């Protein structure tokens, strides 16, 4: 076809483009849930670390210098 | 512009969209595979930090009671 | 011989220290637990997320072993 | 008399155990402080794999930089 080929393309390019677009919608629903779930663990860690550095006063300042 | 020009371009941006979509597909497959790796890493290091506590609590507090450990 | 008062007090005292360092080791582990158990629960949250988005965003052909 | 000898050894027994308890509690910290610096190692990896896979997969993201 010369114009059936054309009305075909425009319709597989609108369907292609719509898949990309809203699969883009959920890739960013992914990296948004991802990033702050890390910020959960990074804060659950950063206070598990502090609990250890503070119960580090449970020794002489010589017998535990690390970290 | 015209009808043969506007055709050979659709032909290019449909191929460029199909190539883009397959690229995007095998770099999701890359992301969830290199994520499943680093996450199990995270788990097997927890199971280090957890059982280093599971024993040092029942081993430095003998008479004392235990919370789940 | 009556430097026995001193011995019997050094023994009530050093023994008290160990009774208080036993208070602190009970504290340290009981809130090392709930602080640990937090991390644990962030993990299987951040884990299952990468199990849903690993199959709600991806064909059936990448059955990455790690996810159920 | 002879219990100036039972006490003197009871002290040495308390004093050495108060002591071995201190360097077991010491070894319990050396091994913790290096086991969450394994988990800190893991975290940094997982995060930069999200930064370098949210930037390379999308246009504009929030946390990463």
PDB file of C-alpha atoms in Angstrom:
ATOM      1  CA  UNK A   1       0.000   0.000   0.000  1.00  0.00           C
ATOM      2  CA  UNK A   2       0.904   3.660  -0.521  1.00  0.00           C
ATOM      3  CA  UNK A   3      -1.606   5.162   1.895  1.00  0.00           C
ATOM      4  CA  UNK A   4      -2.806   1.997   3.644  1.00  0.00           C
ATOM      5  CA  UNK A   5       0.859   1.581   4.598  1.00  0.00           C
ATOM      6  CA  UNK A   6       0.664   5.189   5.861  1.00  0.00           C
ATOM      7  CA  UNK A   7      -2.542   4.810   7.920  1.00  0.00           C
ATOM      8  CA  UNK A   8      -0.961   1.642   9.316  1.00  0.00           C
ATOM      9  CA  UNK A   9       2.301   3.277  10.465  1.00  0.00           C
ATOM     10  CA  UNK A  10       0.579   6.211  12.165  1.00  0.00           C
ATOM     11  CA  UNK A  11      -1.409   3.646  14.190  1.00  0.00           C
ATOM     12  CA  UNK A  12       1.471   1.410  15.204  1.00  0.00           C
ATOM     13  CA  UNK A  13       3.417   4.525  16.132  1.00  0.00           C
ATOM     14  CA  UNK A  14       0.629   5.802  18.320  1.00  0.00           C
ATOM     15  CA  UNK A  15       0.392   2.444  20.089  1.00  0.00           C
ATOM     16  CA  UNK A  16       4.133   2.100  20.414  1.00  0.00           C
ATOM     17  CA  UNK A  17       4.368   5.649  21.733  1.00  0.00           C
ATOM     18  CA  UNK A  18       1.568   5.056  24.283  1.00  0.00           C
ATOM     19  CA  UNK A  19       3.314   1.966  25.675  1.00  0.00           C
ATOM     20  CA  UNK A  20       6.580   3.829  26.172  1.00  0.00           C
ATOM     21  CA  UNK A  21       4.760   6.712  27.828  1.00  0.00           C
ATOM     22  CA  UNK A  22       2.891   4.876  30.527  1.00  0.00           C
ATOM     23  CA  UNK A  23       5.600   2.259  31.064  1.00  0.00           C
ATOM     24  CA  UNK A  24       7.565   5.439  31.747  1.00  0.00           C
ATOM     25  CA  UNK A  25       4.753   6.230  34.188  1.00  0.00           C
ATOM     26  CA  UNK A  26       5.531   3.147  36.227  1.00  0.00           C
ATOM     27  CA  UNK A  27       9.302   3.083  35.956  1.00  0.00           C
ATOM     28  CA  UNK A  28       9.026   6.325  37.862  1.00  0.00           C
ATOM     29  CA  UNK A  29       6.466   4.798  40.185  1.00  0.00           C
ATOM     30  CA  UNK A  30       9.353   2.338  40.780  1.00  0.00           C
ATOM     31  CA  UNK A  31      12.330   4.640  41.389  1.00  0.00           C
ATOM     32  CA  UNK A  32      10.129   6.798  43.633  1.00  0.00           C
ATOM     33  CA  UNK A  33       9.145   3.930  45.921  1.00  0.00           C
ATOM     34  CA  UNK A  34      12.725   2.675  45.606  1.00  0.00           C
ATOM     35  CA  UNK A  35      14.569   5.833  46.676  1.00  0.00           C
ATOM     36  CA  UNK A  36      12.761   6.582  49.905  1.00  0.00           C
ATOM     37  CA  UNK A  37      12.608   2.901  50.922  1.00  0.00           C
ATOM     38  CA  UNK A  38      16.391   3.163  50.821  1.00  0.00           C
ATOM     39  CA  UNK A  39      16.010   6.319  52.919  1.00  0.00           C
ATOM     40  CA  UNK A  40      14.175   4.058  55.386  1.00  0.00           C
ATOM     41  CA  UNK A  41      17.031   1.583  55.697  1.00  0.00           C
ATOM     42  CA  UNK A  42      19.632   4.293  55.608  1.00  0.00           C
ATOM     43  CA  UNK A  43      17.934   5.766  58.681  1.00  0.00           C
ATOM     44  CA  UNK A  44      17.280   2.443  60.378  1.00  0.00           C
ATOM     45  CA  UNK A  45      20.978   1.805  59.851  1.00  0.00           C
ATOM     46  CA  UNK A  46      22.193   5.239  60.904  1.00  0.00           C
ATOM     47  CA  UNK A  47      20.552   4.768  64.304  1.00  0.00           C
ATOM     48  CA  UNK A  48      21.606   1.138  64.694  1.00  0.00           C
ATOM     49  CA  UNK A  49      25.109   2.536  64.168  1.00  0.00           C
ATOM     50  CA  UNK A  50      24.581   5.241  66.760  1.00  0.00           C
ATOM     51  CA  UNK A  51      23.242   2.771  69.328  1.00  0.00           C
ATOM     52  CA  UNK A  52      26.569   0.921  68.965  1.00  0.00           C
ATOM     53  CA  UNK A  53      28.752   4.024  69.073  1.00  0.00           C
ATOM     54  CA  UNK A  54      26.919   5.152  72.245  1.00  0.00           C
ATOM     55  CA  UNK A  55      26.987   1.836  74.070  1.00  0.00           C
ATOM     56  CA  UNK A  56      30.675   2.219  73.145  1.00  0.00           C
ATOM     57  CA  UNK A  57      30.973   4.311  76.298  1.00  0.00           C
ATOM     58  CA  UNK A  58      30.571   0.896  77.958  1.00  0.00           C
ATOM     59  CA  UNK A  59      34.358   0.537  77.810  1.00  0.00           C
ATOM     60  CA  UNK A  60      37.506   2.466  78.628  1.00  0.00           C
ATOM     61  CA  UNK A  61      38.322   5.059  75.908  1.00  0.00           C
ATOM     62  CA  UNK A  62      41.424   2.917  75.208  1.00  0.00           C
ATOM     63  CA  UNK A  63      39.905  -0.582  74.961  1.00  0.00           C
ATOM     64  CA  UNK A  64      37.500   0.607  72.216  1.00  0.00           C
ATOM     65  CA  UNK A  65      38.682   3.375  69.888  1.00  0.00           C
ATOM     66  CA  UNK A  66      37.373   1.849  66.636  1.00  0.00           C
ATOM     67  CA  UNK A  67      35.539   3.273  64.806  1.00  0.00           C
TER      68      UNK A  67
ATOM     69  CA  UNK B   1       7.404  17.439   3.158  1.00  0.00           C
ATOM     70  CA  UNK B   2       4.791  15.448   1.237  1.00  0.00           C
ATOM     71  CA  UNK B   3       3.523  11.854   1.181  1.00  0.00           C
ATOM     72  CA  UNK B   4       6.632   9.837   0.278  1.00  0.00           C
ATOM     73  CA  UNK B   5       8.783  11.996   2.591  1.00  0.00           C
ATOM     74  CA  UNK B   6       6.270  11.749   5.438  1.00  0.00           C
ATOM     75  CA  UNK B   7       6.219   7.997   4.844  1.00  0.00           C
ATOM     76  CA  UNK B   8       9.981   7.213   4.958  1.00  0.00           C
ATOM     77  CA  UNK B   9      10.062   9.087   8.276  1.00  0.00           C
ATOM     78  CA  UNK B  10       7.259   7.191   9.970  1.00  0.00           C
ATOM     79  CA  UNK B  11       9.247   4.193   8.767  1.00  0.00           C
ATOM     80  CA  UNK B  12      12.240   5.547  10.678  1.00  0.00           C
ATOM     81  CA  UNK B  13      10.541   6.665  13.866  1.00  0.00           C
ATOM     82  CA  UNK B  14       8.617   3.390  14.123  1.00  0.00           C
ATOM     83  CA  UNK B  15      11.916   1.512  13.900  1.00  0.00           C
ATOM     84  CA  UNK B  16      13.545   4.016  16.268  1.00  0.00           C
ATOM     85  CA  UNK B  17      10.687   3.519  18.705  1.00  0.00           C
ATOM     86  CA  UNK B  18      10.892  -0.262  18.408  1.00  0.00           C
ATOM     87  CA  UNK B  19      14.675  -0.216  18.926  1.00  0.00           C
ATOM     88  CA  UNK B  20      14.262   2.155  21.854  1.00  0.00           C
ATOM     89  CA  UNK B  21      11.662  -0.126  23.505  1.00  0.00           C
ATOM     90  CA  UNK B  22      13.860  -3.248  23.276  1.00  0.00           C
ATOM     91  CA  UNK B  23      16.821  -1.323  24.626  1.00  0.00           C
ATOM     92  CA  UNK B  24      14.618  -0.226  27.541  1.00  0.00           C
ATOM     93  CA  UNK B  25      13.607  -3.896  27.946  1.00  0.00           C
ATOM     94  CA  UNK B  26      17.058  -5.445  28.262  1.00  0.00           C
ATOM     95  CA  UNK B  27      18.155  -2.710  30.666  1.00  0.00           C
ATOM     96  CA  UNK B  28      15.240  -3.485  32.937  1.00  0.00           C
ATOM     97  CA  UNK B  29      16.272  -7.147  32.822  1.00  0.00           C
ATOM     98  CA  UNK B  30      19.737  -5.853  33.751  1.00  0.00           C
ATOM     99  CA  UNK B  31      18.425  -3.758  36.628  1.00  0.00           C
ATOM    100  CA  UNK B  32      16.344  -6.415  38.385  1.00  0.00           C
ATOM    101  CA  UNK B  33      19.155  -8.896  38.015  1.00  0.00           C
ATOM    102  CA  UNK B  34      21.866  -6.636  39.433  1.00  0.00           C
ATOM    103  CA  UNK B  35      19.320  -5.582  42.064  1.00  0.00           C
ATOM    104  CA  UNK B  36      18.432  -9.122  43.155  1.00  0.00           C
ATOM    105  CA  UNK B  37      22.181  -9.567  43.602  1.00  0.00           C
ATOM    106  CA  UNK B  38      22.894  -6.559  45.777  1.00  0.00           C
ATOM    107  CA  UNK B  39      19.736  -7.227  47.812  1.00  0.00           C
ATOM    108  CA  UNK B  40      20.696 -10.772  48.759  1.00  0.00           C
ATOM    109  CA  UNK B  41      24.094  -9.382  49.687  1.00  0.00           C
ATOM    110  CA  UNK B  42      22.107  -7.112  52.031  1.00  0.00           C
ATOM    111  CA  UNK B  43      20.278 -10.130  53.455  1.00  0.00           C
ATOM    112  CA  UNK B  44      23.284 -12.384  53.980  1.00  0.00           C
ATOM    113  CA  UNK B  45      24.947  -9.488  55.827  1.00  0.00           C
ATOM    114  CA  UNK B  46      21.931  -8.993  58.034  1.00  0.00           C
ATOM    115  CA  UNK B  47      22.043 -12.717  58.845  1.00  0.00           C
ATOM    116  CA  UNK B  48      25.632 -12.071  59.869  1.00  0.00           C
ATOM    117  CA  UNK B  49      24.771  -9.096  62.095  1.00  0.00           C
ATOM    118  CA  UNK B  50      21.701 -10.879  63.466  1.00  0.00           C
ATOM    119  CA  UNK B  51      23.288 -14.145  64.531  1.00  0.00           C
ATOM    120  CA  UNK B  52      26.380 -12.384  65.860  1.00  0.00           C
ATOM    121  CA  UNK B  53      23.776 -10.944  68.218  1.00  0.00           C
ATOM    122  CA  UNK B  54      21.756 -14.137  68.620  1.00  0.00           C
ATOM    123  CA  UNK B  55      24.661 -15.811  70.418  1.00  0.00           C
ATOM    124  CA  UNK B  56      26.438 -12.874  72.139  1.00  0.00           C
ATOM    125  CA  UNK B  57      23.151 -12.171  73.912  1.00  0.00           C
ATOM    126  CA  UNK B  58      22.561 -15.705  75.151  1.00  0.00           C
ATOM    127  CA  UNK B  59      26.313 -15.959  75.829  1.00  0.00           C
ATOM    128  CA  UNK B  60      26.947 -12.809  77.892  1.00  0.00           C
ATOM    129  CA  UNK B  61      23.646 -12.874  79.835  1.00  0.00           C
ATOM    130  CA  UNK B  62      23.371 -16.508  80.940  1.00  0.00           C
ATOM    131  CA  UNK B  63      20.865 -16.329  83.778  1.00  0.00           C
ATOM    132  CA  UNK B  64      19.109 -13.436  82.005  1.00  0.00           C
ATOM    133  CA  UNK B  65      16.081 -13.977  79.781  1.00  0.00           C
ATOM    134  CA  UNK B  66      16.042 -13.763  75.998  1.00  0.00           C
ATOM    135  CA  UNK B  67      13.855 -11.688  73.688  1.00  0.00           C
ATOM    136  CA  UNK B  68      13.171 -13.993  70.709  1.00  0.00           C
ATOM    137  CA  UNK B  69      16.914 -14.207  69.758  1.00  0.00           C
TER     138      UNK B  69
ATOM    139  CA  UNK C   1      44.459 -10.660 111.279  1.00  0.00           C
ATOM    140  CA  UNK C   2      41.692  -8.143 110.554  1.00  0.00           C
ATOM    141  CA  UNK C   3      42.243  -6.699 107.096  1.00  0.00           C
ATOM    142  CA  UNK C   4      39.212  -8.851 106.350  1.00  0.00           C
ATOM    143  CA  UNK C   5      36.847  -5.878 106.428  1.00  0.00           C
ATOM    144  CA  UNK C   6      38.647  -4.577 103.311  1.00  0.00           C
ATOM    145  CA  UNK C   7      38.452  -7.886 101.465  1.00  0.00           C
ATOM    146  CA  UNK C   8      34.756  -8.361 102.192  1.00  0.00           C
ATOM    147  CA  UNK C   9      33.971  -4.848 100.877  1.00  0.00           C
ATOM    148  CA  UNK C  10      36.086  -5.075  97.719  1.00  0.00           C
ATOM    149  CA  UNK C  11      33.976  -8.200  97.161  1.00  0.00           C
ATOM    150  CA  UNK C  12      30.611  -6.525  97.696  1.00  0.00           C
ATOM    151  CA  UNK C  13      31.722  -3.713  95.327  1.00  0.00           C
ATOM    152  CA  UNK C  14      33.431  -5.379  92.387  1.00  0.00           C
ATOM    153  CA  UNK C  15      30.415  -7.703  92.602  1.00  0.00           C
ATOM    154  CA  UNK C  16      28.101  -4.679  92.368  1.00  0.00           C
ATOM    155  CA  UNK C  17      29.922  -3.359  89.273  1.00  0.00           C
ATOM    156  CA  UNK C  18      29.228  -6.696  87.565  1.00  0.00           C
ATOM    157  CA  UNK C  19      25.606  -6.342  88.623  1.00  0.00           C
ATOM    158  CA  UNK C  20      25.406  -2.943  86.914  1.00  0.00           C
ATOM    159  CA  UNK C  21      27.400  -3.879  83.821  1.00  0.00           C
ATOM    160  CA  UNK C  22      24.792  -6.652  83.734  1.00  0.00           C
ATOM    161  CA  UNK C  23      22.038  -4.022  83.737  1.00  0.00           C
ATOM    162  CA  UNK C  24      23.686  -2.305  80.755  1.00  0.00           C
ATOM    163  CA  UNK C  25      24.265  -5.449  78.735  1.00  0.00           C
ATOM    164  CA  UNK C  26      20.572  -6.247  79.148  1.00  0.00           C
ATOM    165  CA  UNK C  27      19.596  -2.776  77.914  1.00  0.00           C
ATOM    166  CA  UNK C  28      22.091  -2.882  75.049  1.00  0.00           C
ATOM    167  CA  UNK C  29      20.810  -6.174  73.623  1.00  0.00           C
ATOM    168  CA  UNK C  30      17.079  -5.623  74.149  1.00  0.00           C
ATOM    169  CA  UNK C  31      17.144  -2.386  72.132  1.00  0.00           C
ATOM    170  CA  UNK C  32      19.722  -3.786  69.780  1.00  0.00           C
ATOM    171  CA  UNK C  33      16.905  -6.216  68.979  1.00  0.00           C
ATOM    172  CA  UNK C  34      14.053  -3.870  68.104  1.00  0.00           C
ATOM    173  CA  UNK C  35      16.527  -1.625  66.220  1.00  0.00           C
ATOM    174  CA  UNK C  36      17.634  -4.706  64.286  1.00  0.00           C
ATOM    175  CA  UNK C  37      14.066  -5.947  63.769  1.00  0.00           C
ATOM    176  CA  UNK C  38      13.344  -2.591  62.082  1.00  0.00           C
ATOM    177  CA  UNK C  39      16.009  -3.021  59.395  1.00  0.00           C
ATOM    178  CA  UNK C  40      14.742  -6.540  58.917  1.00  0.00           C
ATOM    179  CA  UNK C  41      11.291  -5.195  58.018  1.00  0.00           C
ATOM    180  CA  UNK C  42      12.544  -2.492  55.694  1.00  0.00           C
ATOM    181  CA  UNK C  43      14.316  -5.306  53.843  1.00  0.00           C
ATOM    182  CA  UNK C  44      11.333  -7.472  53.015  1.00  0.00           C
ATOM    183  CA  UNK C  45       9.463  -4.264  52.120  1.00  0.00           C
ATOM    184  CA  UNK C  46      12.211  -3.131  49.726  1.00  0.00           C
ATOM    185  CA  UNK C  47      12.448  -6.776  48.735  1.00  0.00           C
ATOM    186  CA  UNK C  48       8.857  -7.450  47.691  1.00  0.00           C
ATOM    187  CA  UNK C  49       8.734  -4.097  45.932  1.00  0.00           C
ATOM    188  CA  UNK C  50      11.481  -5.487  43.673  1.00  0.00           C
ATOM    189  CA  UNK C  51       9.347  -8.582  43.356  1.00  0.00           C
ATOM    190  CA  UNK C  52       6.212  -6.741  42.221  1.00  0.00           C
ATOM    191  CA  UNK C  53       7.905  -4.146  40.035  1.00  0.00           C
ATOM    192  CA  UNK C  54      10.094  -7.038  38.857  1.00  0.00           C
ATOM    193  CA  UNK C  55       7.045  -8.787  37.374  1.00  0.00           C
ATOM    194  CA  UNK C  56       4.571  -5.901  36.897  1.00  0.00           C
ATOM    195  CA  UNK C  57       7.186  -4.191  34.677  1.00  0.00           C
ATOM    196  CA  UNK C  58       8.794  -7.118  32.965  1.00  0.00           C
ATOM    197  CA  UNK C  59       7.970 -10.092  30.697  1.00  0.00           C
ATOM    198  CA  UNK C  60       7.750 -13.639  32.006  1.00  0.00           C
ATOM    199  CA  UNK C  61      11.148 -14.582  30.530  1.00  0.00           C
ATOM    200  CA  UNK C  62      13.274 -12.964  33.263  1.00  0.00           C
ATOM    201  CA  UNK C  63      12.240 -15.275  36.098  1.00  0.00           C
ATOM    202  CA  UNK C  64      15.139 -14.059  38.205  1.00  0.00           C
ATOM    203  CA  UNK C  65      15.551 -16.848  40.777  1.00  0.00           C
ATOM    204  CA  UNK C  66      15.692 -14.420  43.713  1.00  0.00           C
ATOM    205  CA  UNK C  67      12.041 -13.405  43.395  1.00  0.00           C
ATOM    206  CA  UNK C  68       9.507 -16.165  44.277  1.00  0.00           C
TER     207      UNK C  68
ATOM    208  CA  UNK D   1      43.120 -17.207 109.718  1.00  0.00           C
ATOM    209  CA  UNK D   2      42.306 -19.558 106.797  1.00  0.00           C
ATOM    210  CA  UNK D   3      39.438 -17.462 105.405  1.00  0.00           C
ATOM    211  CA  UNK D   4      41.771 -14.585 104.862  1.00  0.00           C
ATOM    212  CA  UNK D   5      42.625 -17.157 102.172  1.00  0.00           C
ATOM    213  CA  UNK D   6      39.114 -18.002 101.004  1.00  0.00           C
ATOM    214  CA  UNK D   7      38.329 -14.311 100.585  1.00  0.00           C
ATOM    215  CA  UNK D   8      41.623 -13.377  98.912  1.00  0.00           C
ATOM    216  CA  UNK D   9      40.957 -15.987  96.222  1.00  0.00           C
ATOM    217  CA  UNK D  10      37.280 -15.014  95.880  1.00  0.00           C
ATOM    218  CA  UNK D  11      38.470 -11.491  95.029  1.00  0.00           C
ATOM    219  CA  UNK D  12      40.974 -12.683  92.413  1.00  0.00           C
ATOM    220  CA  UNK D  13      38.081 -14.718  90.945  1.00  0.00           C
ATOM    221  CA  UNK D  14      35.653 -11.828  90.806  1.00  0.00           C
ATOM    222  CA  UNK D  15      38.383  -9.453  89.621  1.00  0.00           C
ATOM    223  CA  UNK D  16      39.473 -11.700  86.741  1.00  0.00           C
ATOM    224  CA  UNK D  17      35.928 -12.449  85.623  1.00  0.00           C
ATOM    225  CA  UNK D  18      34.846  -8.809  85.705  1.00  0.00           C
ATOM    226  CA  UNK D  19      37.906  -8.557  83.453  1.00  0.00           C
ATOM    227  CA  UNK D  20      37.335 -11.440  81.031  1.00  0.00           C
ATOM    228  CA  UNK D  21      33.779 -10.111  80.752  1.00  0.00           C
ATOM    229  CA  UNK D  22      35.265  -6.789  79.602  1.00  0.00           C
ATOM    230  CA  UNK D  23      37.330  -8.112  76.716  1.00  0.00           C
ATOM    231  CA  UNK D  24      34.482 -10.373  75.591  1.00  0.00           C
ATOM    232  CA  UNK D  25      32.260  -7.312  75.584  1.00  0.00           C
ATOM    233  CA  UNK D  26      35.188  -5.720  73.777  1.00  0.00           C
ATOM    234  CA  UNK D  27      35.310  -8.455  71.140  1.00  0.00           C
ATOM    235  CA  UNK D  28      31.516  -8.206  70.829  1.00  0.00           C
ATOM    236  CA  UNK D  29      31.993  -4.606  69.645  1.00  0.00           C
ATOM    237  CA  UNK D  30      34.956  -5.068  67.296  1.00  0.00           C
ATOM    238  CA  UNK D  31      32.825  -7.631  65.447  1.00  0.00           C
ATOM    239  CA  UNK D  32      29.638  -5.608  65.422  1.00  0.00           C
ATOM    240  CA  UNK D  33      31.287  -2.372  64.254  1.00  0.00           C
ATOM    241  CA  UNK D  34      32.721  -4.318  61.305  1.00  0.00           C
ATOM    242  CA  UNK D  35      29.499  -6.218  60.519  1.00  0.00           C
ATOM    243  CA  UNK D  36      27.363  -3.141  59.914  1.00  0.00           C
ATOM    244  CA  UNK D  37      30.251  -1.681  57.902  1.00  0.00           C
ATOM    245  CA  UNK D  38      29.522  -4.696  55.761  1.00  0.00           C
ATOM    246  CA  UNK D  39      25.890  -3.638  55.549  1.00  0.00           C
ATOM    247  CA  UNK D  40      26.938  -0.035  54.970  1.00  0.00           C
ATOM    248  CA  UNK D  41      29.065  -1.425  52.148  1.00  0.00           C
ATOM    249  CA  UNK D  42      26.018  -3.205  50.702  1.00  0.00           C
ATOM    250  CA  UNK D  43      23.763  -0.158  51.011  1.00  0.00           C
ATOM    251  CA  UNK D  44      26.111   2.156  49.118  1.00  0.00           C
ATOM    252  CA  UNK D  45      26.230  -0.395  46.286  1.00  0.00           C
ATOM    253  CA  UNK D  46      22.442  -0.850  46.030  1.00  0.00           C
ATOM    254  CA  UNK D  47      21.937   2.927  46.102  1.00  0.00           C
ATOM    255  CA  UNK D  48      24.427   3.855  43.386  1.00  0.00           C
ATOM    256  CA  UNK D  49      22.908   1.037  41.268  1.00  0.00           C
ATOM    257  CA  UNK D  50      19.602   2.894  41.627  1.00  0.00           C
ATOM    258  CA  UNK D  51      21.098   6.321  40.904  1.00  0.00           C
ATOM    259  CA  UNK D  52      22.927   4.982  37.820  1.00  0.00           C
ATOM    260  CA  UNK D  53      19.734   3.118  36.760  1.00  0.00           C
ATOM    261  CA  UNK D  54      17.181   5.840  37.478  1.00  0.00           C
ATOM    262  CA  UNK D  55      19.290   8.418  35.620  1.00  0.00           C
ATOM    263  CA  UNK D  56      19.963   6.085  32.668  1.00  0.00           C
ATOM    264  CA  UNK D  57      16.338   4.875  32.381  1.00  0.00           C
ATOM    265  CA  UNK D  58      14.307   8.071  32.803  1.00  0.00           C
ATOM    266  CA  UNK D  59      14.408  11.849  32.081  1.00  0.00           C
ATOM    267  CA  UNK D  60      13.303  13.672  35.304  1.00  0.00           C
ATOM    268  CA  UNK D  61      15.164  11.119  40.142  1.00  0.00           C
ATOM    269  CA  UNK D  62      14.256  12.912  43.382  1.00  0.00           C
ATOM    270  CA  UNK D  63      16.698  11.379  45.906  1.00  0.00           C
ATOM    271  CA  UNK D  64      19.516  10.526  43.508  1.00  0.00           C
ATOM    272  CA  UNK D  65      22.239  12.973  42.372  1.00  0.00           C
TER     273      UNK D  65
END
